Amino acid sequence: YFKLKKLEKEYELLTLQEDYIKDEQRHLKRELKRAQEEV
Amino acid sequence: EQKIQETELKIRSKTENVRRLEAQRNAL
Amino acid sequence: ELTKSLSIAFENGDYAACEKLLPPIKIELIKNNLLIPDLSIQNDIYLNDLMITKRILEVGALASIQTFNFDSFENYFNQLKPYYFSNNHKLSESDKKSKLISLYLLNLLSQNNTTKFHSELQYLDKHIKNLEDDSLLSYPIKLDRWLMEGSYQKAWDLLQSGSQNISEFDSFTDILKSAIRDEIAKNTELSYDFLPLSNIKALLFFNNEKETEKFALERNWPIVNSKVYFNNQSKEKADYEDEMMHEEDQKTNIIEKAMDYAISIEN
Amino acid sequence: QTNIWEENWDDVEVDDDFTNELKAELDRYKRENQ
Amino acid sequence: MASTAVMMDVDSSGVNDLHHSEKKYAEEDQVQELLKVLNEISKTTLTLDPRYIWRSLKDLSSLRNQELLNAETLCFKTIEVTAEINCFMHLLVQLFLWDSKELEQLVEFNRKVVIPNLLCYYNLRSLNLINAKLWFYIYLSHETLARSSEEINSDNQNIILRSTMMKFLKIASLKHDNETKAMLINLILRDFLNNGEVDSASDFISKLEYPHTDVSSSLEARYFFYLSKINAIQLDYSTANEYIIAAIRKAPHNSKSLGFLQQSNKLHCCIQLLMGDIPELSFFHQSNMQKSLLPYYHLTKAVKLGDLKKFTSTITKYKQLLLKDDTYQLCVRLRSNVIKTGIRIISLTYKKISLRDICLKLNLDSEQTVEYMVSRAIRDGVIEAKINHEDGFIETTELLNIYDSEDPQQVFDERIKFANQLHDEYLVSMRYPEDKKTQ
Amino acid sequence: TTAAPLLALLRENQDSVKTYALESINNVVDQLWSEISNELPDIEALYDDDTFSDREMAALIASKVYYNLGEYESAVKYALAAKDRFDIDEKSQFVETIVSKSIEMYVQEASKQYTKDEQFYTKDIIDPKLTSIFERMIEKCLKASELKLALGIALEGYRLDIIESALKSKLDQDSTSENVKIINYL
Numbered sequence: 001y002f003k004l005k006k007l008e009k010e011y012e013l014l015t016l017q018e019d020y021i022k023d024e025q026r027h028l029k030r031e032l033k034r035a036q037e038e039v
Numbered sequence: 040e041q042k043i044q045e046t047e048l049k050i051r052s053k054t055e056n057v058r059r060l061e062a063q064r065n066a067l
Numbered sequence: 068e069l070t071k072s073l074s075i076a077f078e079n080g081d082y083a084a085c086e087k088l089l090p091p092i093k094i095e096l097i098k099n100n101l102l103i104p105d106l107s108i109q110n111d112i113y114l115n116d117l118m119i120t121k122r123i124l125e126v127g128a129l130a131s132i133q134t135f136n137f138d139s140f141e142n143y144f145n146q147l148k149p150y151y152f153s154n155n156h157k158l159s160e161s162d163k164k165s166k167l168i169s170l171y172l173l174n175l176l177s178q179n180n181t182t183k184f185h186s187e188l189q190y191l192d193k194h195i196k197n198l199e200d201d202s203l204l205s206y207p208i209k210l211d212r213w214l215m216e217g218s219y220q221k222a223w224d225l226l227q228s229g230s231q232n233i234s235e236f237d238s239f240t241d242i243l244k245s246a247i248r249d250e251i252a253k254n255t256e257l258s259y260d261f262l263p264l265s266n267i268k269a270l271l272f273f274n275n276e277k278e279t280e281k282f283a284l285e286r287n288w289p290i291v292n293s294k295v296y297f298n299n300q301s302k303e304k305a306d307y308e309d310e311m312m313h314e315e316d317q318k319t320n321i322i323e324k325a326m327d328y329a330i331s332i333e334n
Numbered sequence: 335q336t337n338i339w340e341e342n343w344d345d346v347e348v349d350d351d352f353t354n355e356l357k358a359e360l361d362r363y364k365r366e367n368q
Numbered sequence: 369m370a371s372t373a374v375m376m377d378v379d380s381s382g383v384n385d386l387h388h389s390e391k392k393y394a395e396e397d398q399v400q401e402l403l404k405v406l407n408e409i410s411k412t413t414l415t416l417d418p419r420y421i422w423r424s425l426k427d428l429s430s431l432r433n434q435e436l437l438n439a440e441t442l443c444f445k446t447i448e449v450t451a452e453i454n455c456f457m458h459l460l461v462q463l464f465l466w467d468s469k470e471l472e473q474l475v476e477f478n479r480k481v482v483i484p485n486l487l488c489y490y491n492l493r494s495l496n497l498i499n500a501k502l503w504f505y506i507y508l509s510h511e512t513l514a515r516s517s518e519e520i521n522s523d524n525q526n527i528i529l530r531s532t533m534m535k536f537l538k539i540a541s542l543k544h545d546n547e548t549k550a551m552l553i554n555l556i557l558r559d560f561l562n563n564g565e566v567d568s569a570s571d572f573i574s575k576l577e578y579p580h581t582d583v584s585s586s587l588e589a590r591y592f593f594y595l596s597k598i599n600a601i602q603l604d605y606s607t608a609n610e611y612i613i614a615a616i617r618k619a620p621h622n623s624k625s626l627g628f629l630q631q632s633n634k635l636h637c638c639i640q641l642l643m644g645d646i647p648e649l650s651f652f653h654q655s656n657m658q659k660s661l662l663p664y665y666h667l668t669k670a671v672k673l674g675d676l677k678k679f680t681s682t683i684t685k686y687k688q689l690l691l692k693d694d695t696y697q698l699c700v701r702l703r704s705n706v707i708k709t710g711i712r713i714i715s716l717t718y719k720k721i722s723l724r725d726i727c728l729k730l731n732l733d734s735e736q737t738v739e740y741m742v743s744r745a746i747r748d749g750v751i752e753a754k755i756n757h758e759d760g761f762i763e764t765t766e767l768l769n770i771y772d773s774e775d776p777q778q779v780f781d782e783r784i785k786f787a788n789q790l791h792d793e794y795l796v797s798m799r800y801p802e803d804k805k806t807q
Numbered sequence: 808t809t810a811a812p813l814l815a816l817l818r819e820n821q822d823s824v825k826t827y828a829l830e831s832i833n834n835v836v837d838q839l840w841s842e843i844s845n846e847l848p849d850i851e852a853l854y855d856d857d858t859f860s861d862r863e864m865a866a867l868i869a870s871k872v873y874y875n876l877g878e879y880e881s882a883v884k885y886a887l888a889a890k891d892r893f894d895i896d897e898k899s900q901f902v903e904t905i906v907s908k909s910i911e912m913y914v915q916e917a918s919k920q921y922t923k924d925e926q927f928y929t930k931d932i933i934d935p936k937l938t939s940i941f942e943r944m945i946e947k948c949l950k951a952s953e954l955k956l957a958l959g960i961a962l963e964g965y966r967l968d969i970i971e972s973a974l975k976s977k978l979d980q981d982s983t984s985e986n987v988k989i990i991n992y993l
Contacts, residue, residue, distance in 0.1 A: 001948060004043040005959025011050035018053065021060035028067035029334065040944065041907045042960070048492060048543040061806060062799035094821050102816070102824075103831040104808045106524045138818065145815030149808045154563055155518030183567065186601040188697060190565030195687075195696065208700070216704055217747040218740035254743030259756050266757050270739060294758060315774060322784055329788045333795075335653060342648040344672065522808055531838035537875060538837070538901050556841075564809075568841040575877060 069095065070119060074126065082130035089127045096120050104149040113150065113159045121150040121159055125167060132170055135238050144171055152192050169203030170236060176207040176214070177239035177246060184211075203231045217254050219247045223272060248272070252286055260297040267295045370414030374422055376405060377458070384454045392495050399454070399497075403461065412467045418442060419455065426452050428485060432459050435477050453497065456481050460502040471506040475525075478503055482532075491539065496547035496582075500533060504555050511562070530556050542579075550578040550591050557594035561694075569598045589619035593632055600635070601697065609639035630660035631693070637664035638698050644709050644750075646671050663689050667699055674706020707733070708745040716753055716764035723760035810839035810846075817846050822859040829853075829864040833871075833892070837901075840872035847872060854888060867892035874901055874908075883909040887936045895943055906940065913941045914963050921965045928966045945969055949976075958993045 073088035096102030100109075101117035113121065128143035144167055150156060151164045168187075175184040188208065191197055198204045206229060213222030223244065226232050232240045239246075248271045255262060255270055267283065268276040280290070289296040312318070380402050387395035409415070417440030423429035424444050429452050433440070459481060463474050471478075482503060490497070499505075507529060510516065516523065533552035540549045550557075553572045560566040578591050592611035599608035612632060621629055633656065640647050646668045652661045663686035670679035683690060683699060690696035714729045715721060723738075724731065730738040742762060745751050753764040790797075813835070816828035836843065843850075850869050854862045866885030870893075873882030886893045886905050895906060913933060920927030928938075941964070948957035954973050961969040978986050 001040055001042050001044075001951065001960065002953045002956035004046060005955050005962065008043055008046050008050075009959070011047065011053070014050055014057065015053055018056045018060055021057075021064065025060060025063055025067060032067075040947070041903050042910045042944065044907065045491070045541065045543050046911075051492075058799055058803050062795075062803050065802045065806070066798060090821055093819065094823055097821075097824055097827045102812070103827070104521070104812060106521045106527065106808060106835070108521050142815035142819055146812035148811040149522070152563070153518070153522030153808055155520075155522045182602045183565070185603070185697065186565040186567060189601045189694075190560070190563065192563040194694075195691065212700060212703075215701060216708070217744035218737050220734075220737045220740055250747065251740065251743060254740070254747040258739075258743040258746040258754065260754070261756050261758060263758050266739075270743075312774070319774075319777065319781070322781055326784055326787055329791070333791075341650040344646075344648055344650065344668075524808070527808060527838060531835075534838045534841075534875070538899070538904075541900075541904065542877070568844065571841050571844045571876075574844070575875075 073123070074119060077126045077130055082134045085126075085130040086134065089123065089130075092123055096123075102146065104153065113156075117150065118159065121147060121161065124150065125161065125163060128167060129163070129235075132174075132238065133235060137174060140167075141171060141174070144168070154192065165197070165201045166203050166231070166235075169201055169206065169231065172204065172207045173210075173231070173236060173239060176210065177242050179246065181215075203236075206231065206236075214247070217250055219251065223247055244272075248282070252282065255295075256286075256288075256297050256300050259295075260300065262295045262297075264290070264293050264295055370418050373409035373411075373415050374418065376402070376409055377419075377422075377455070381451045381454065384451055387495075388450065396495050396497075399457070406458070406461050406466075410466055412436070412438070412462065414440075416440070416462065416467070418444065423448060423452055423455060428452060428456070428481070431480065431484075432456065432477070435459060435462075435474060450494075450497075453486065453494070456486065457497055457499075460499060460506075463506065464502075465509070472510055475506060475510060478506055479532075487535070487539070491541055491543050491545055495544070498536070498548050500536065500548040500551050500555070501587075504529065504533075504551070526559070530559065537575075542576075544582070546579060547583045547587075550576070551587055554587065554590055554594050557598075561594065561597060566594075566598050569595070573598075585619035586621065586624070589615040589632075593635070596635055596639075600638075603642075605639050605642040609636065609643075612636040612639065625655070627659075630656070634660050634664065634693055634695065637661060637668070638695055641667060641671055641699065641702050644671070644702065644705055667702075671702060671706050674703065674709055676703050676707065679703055679706070704741075704744070705750070708750055711742075711745050712751045716751055716767070718764060719766070720753075720761050720763040723755070723757065723762050726755075726762035726764075808835075810835070810842040813839070814842060814846055817849055817853075822856075822861075825853070825859055826861050826864070829861055829868060833864050833868050836868050836871045837875075840868070840875045843868075844872050844876060854885065861892075863889040863892050870905060871901065874905060879905070879908045880912065883912060883937075887934060890936065895940060895947065906944065909937055910941060910944065913937050914960075917964055917966075925965065928964065929968070942966075942969065949973060952977075954989065955993060958989075962993065 069088060069092045073085055073092055076082075076085040076088055093102065096117075099116060099120070101112055101120040105112055109115075119126075124143040124147035126143075128140040128147065131137070131139035131143065144151075147164065147167065150159060151168070168191075172184060172187060175187060178184075184207070188194055188198070198208070206225070210222045210225065213219050226236075226240050226243060229236060229240065251270055255267060262270075264276045264279060268274075268279045271279050271282065273279050279295070282288075283290055283295045289298045316323075380399065383395045383398040383402075386392070386398070412419075416436045417438060420429060420433050420436060420440045421442045421444035423432075426448050429448070432452075432455075459474075459477075462468065463471050468474065482498075487498075501508075507526065511526070513519075513523075519525065530552075533555060536545070536552060537549065539545055550572070553569075556564075557566060557569060557572070560569070566572075573595075578588050592615045596608040596611040596615065599605065599611070602608075612635060615632055616629060616636070633652070637649070637652060639645075641664070649656075649661060649665045649668055652665070656662065657665065663682060666682040666686060667679070670682050673679075679699075680703070683696065687696055690699070711726075711729065714726065720726075726742065727735065727738045730741055734741065739757065742753075742755060746753060746755075751764070752767055753762060755762040810832070813828055813832045816824055816832075819825070819828070832839075832843065847869055850865045850872075853859060853865045854869070856862055863885075867889035870882035870884075870886040870889070873879065873885070876882075882905055886909060893902070893905075895902075916933050916937075917928055920930075920932055924930070927933075945957050945960065945964070945966075948954065948960065951957070954977065957973055958970060961967075961973070974986065974990065977989070980986075982989065
């Protein structure tokens, strides 16, 4: 049970950690293309 | 007891999708 | 005890009367502990007590199948089955145990479940060692040999002559005969459109052709005088198995789509 | 058996050629009989 | 000497400490790689003898000394923990008939290793440090019995084992409690392949495949291997072969190619037989019989013709070898299947033949069974022809297509399903190089 | 051994037998549920026979099969059905598993219950069996007497009844600064 509420809970972050990225993923993806234009 | 025990293994498995996006990071 | 009473009852035939004796005796081996295969070595049960316990399974099954019950038969059989085959089970062994499974394989055979039938031959412990030495056991597969591919000639003949058919087996023999011919019926239906009513009866091994004529019409077979016809040998169209293949482009479009996503999600 | 022959389909069969001639005679011998 | 032996173990423990740090990606694969090196030094002599001292002092270490059972003595709560387990691993490893003969000593010790302070807390911790093969591989030997009487009641230890393996199937929590798993099944599978009917294989199938990645392709293939033999008398052939076609190279075995892959191949040969295909044994001539194919060749040799007599003779001769491999059950079907195969080439070529020429081939074989025998054939397809005896003319269909159908395009979806094949699996292997650059 | 008799004993009458079937079965389920996994349809119906009492045997038996089938809300339900065949102090990884399995269910339930009402837990909507066993483990958590253990649960459990009492009880108990800190910690 115990130390996880301490520990385990801190992994919700690591969930978001993914969730930070695939967002930013499309960024570079698009940031590519409109930039892929001018180059 | 083991109530929250394996609950790690949920997110403990999530360690990967990180690294995909991590692979992607470079890859992007 | 009820032990021998039924053991006498069965011994007397009278298997209807033998039937109701089983459950109480079935309540015995509960407490007698025999009915459950005893994983802890009991020293002497198998032959101390469990002897006829091993038999009452046989016996009860024997009567049940003689009374044309099958699960009961098989149930008892399933229960004999460890005492039949524990793995090692030389501790006790018996004979019609062959006959039983023989009957039961033949049952399975009639039960028209191919793999399990065969995979039971695989589940069989000693196979050929067991198998070939029992004509009863020798029926189903040799039959199956015939049966499976669809020439029944001697097989169908054999089962009329079958000593087990001649002894206890005529239960499925009847079923089987019909069970046989329905395939031939299709095989004929496959092999033939228009077949003389004689030939099909000759095929169906019938004496009256109106015997057949039922089947053909029970099959719903187009028929004129003297000849069974197949205008439609099959079920073509008929509702389900639709909306998938023809999955010409849709699936391939999705495939395309997929491939294009295999192209797109490749990003 | 050795290493690389022309391999497949498959070993075919054997005793044909002379058999043929044995018959090529017989054939023609039958055709002599013809 | 014993040093260098232990020095390996030391370095292993050194890498076990790399596990005592964390997974064990190295350490396991190290242990794996070490398990390869397990052959080299070996003995027990001062290996096990100082090992006690090297272990000294833990109770189970002294318990394992019961397995040592020798003259060791000499001299030498934390650094001793999973090492001892890892040595209990080696304790297993020790016993391959390496450093052992009768593991029935160790059988008990297996449990008395596995059960105590083991088979307990390891869920994610011990990462297939269990080798249940090595567990059972012991009993595998013992199953040379025969002897044990079974033994017992019948044979409950192996029963209990299945249950004990079940007790891991229990412990298989899908928390990554996996790798070893379907060996336990592979066991039970081959335990069915001992006496049994796998069909709870379906229930085994119901759960899973050995998911997924971390398992040795071997067992993953050895999975399929048995998983084939399911479909064997389940009478699925393709999928069975598809398992073989998922099996063979594919789990690289070369050492295990020799005795073991023949078995694999032995079954593989049977498949196309079940499918009547008879691929070219031209290679299957070699790395083969010797000890595997050639009866299958003899079968194929028959199955090319499928002359029942001549066919049967093969079996009649090789039955025991069949029997040895329990391939006997097979081929009985394929008897007329080739006879029917020939039927197709008897000249179904003519859009018919008359009855009694296509009877003639059966008038070469049997009569008016022909009716059946052809209906027996026409039954399954396997030929496409028609007849009516009213005509007594056995009418052999075109078998002719201008295809323009999806038929090849099915075979493309096949390809297409591989259009990603590594094309995707590159992206799979794109991570490893570049994300290990990030470290 | 192999379940074929017990498979056979199943349909066989005399709920006595079925008991002794289930009894013997129950013990040997663990391995042989595999064979038995096909008998579950009857076993289902068996649990639907109020005539045969013990069917909670089969229910938990099915639960054994269901873990062994990876079925849980199945298993849990029939473990929940058991109550007798089932107990928390009964120790198998399975039991520990199914409990822990059974448990998690509560949380979102409770959370979904928490969603609408925050006194949800004061009410019946959650299967009390779980809630009981939940709290019974919370009791065990109280007897574990490290209560973030209980709290972080009851945190998500949203049960102040647990929480406050866990505090209040512990309050008078000991940990002068800690009972303060335990709060703060939480």
